[PDB]
Amino acid sequence: KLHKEPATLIKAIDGDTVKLMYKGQPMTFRLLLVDTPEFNEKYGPEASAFTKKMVENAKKIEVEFDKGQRTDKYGRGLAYIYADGKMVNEALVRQGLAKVAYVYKGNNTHEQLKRKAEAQAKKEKLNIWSE
């Protein structure tokens, strides 16, 4: 019931935002269901680096909207972002560089996938969970 749509990287921004060209227009995308620390914070630089490498190295970036709101109050696109078929959102959580967060009803299709990744990152005491 969700579909992957094409996009191209404009520029990495931080752990959980990225600038993409979508349907030919520049847009800042905020990754659904996750929260990375701010660049100024602990693991913030590492979250930024992780996402940056992931999208910069991708041959193919895809955007997948959920069933609900597609833009937030700041005009940012809200999507699951994939790099060569791998979801950036889930990968950050799996590596402990993001927490599952901002789970609003109707835009939560991938919630359970994320929660499973967080549990495994927490079990492995990775990054954020190494405290």
Ligand SMILES: Cc1cn([C@H]2C[C@H](OP(=O)(O)O)[C@@H](COP(=O)(O)O)O2)c(=O)[nH]c1=O
């Ligand atoms: C991820 C996400 C964030 N937001 C809003 C809520 C938060 O509002 P406030 O700015 O009032 O805190 C903000 C969190 O984004 P950041 O984590 O990028 O700051 O973006 C949504 O509305 N929907 C979403 O799916």
Ligand SMILES: [Ca+2]
């Ligand atoms: Ca954040």
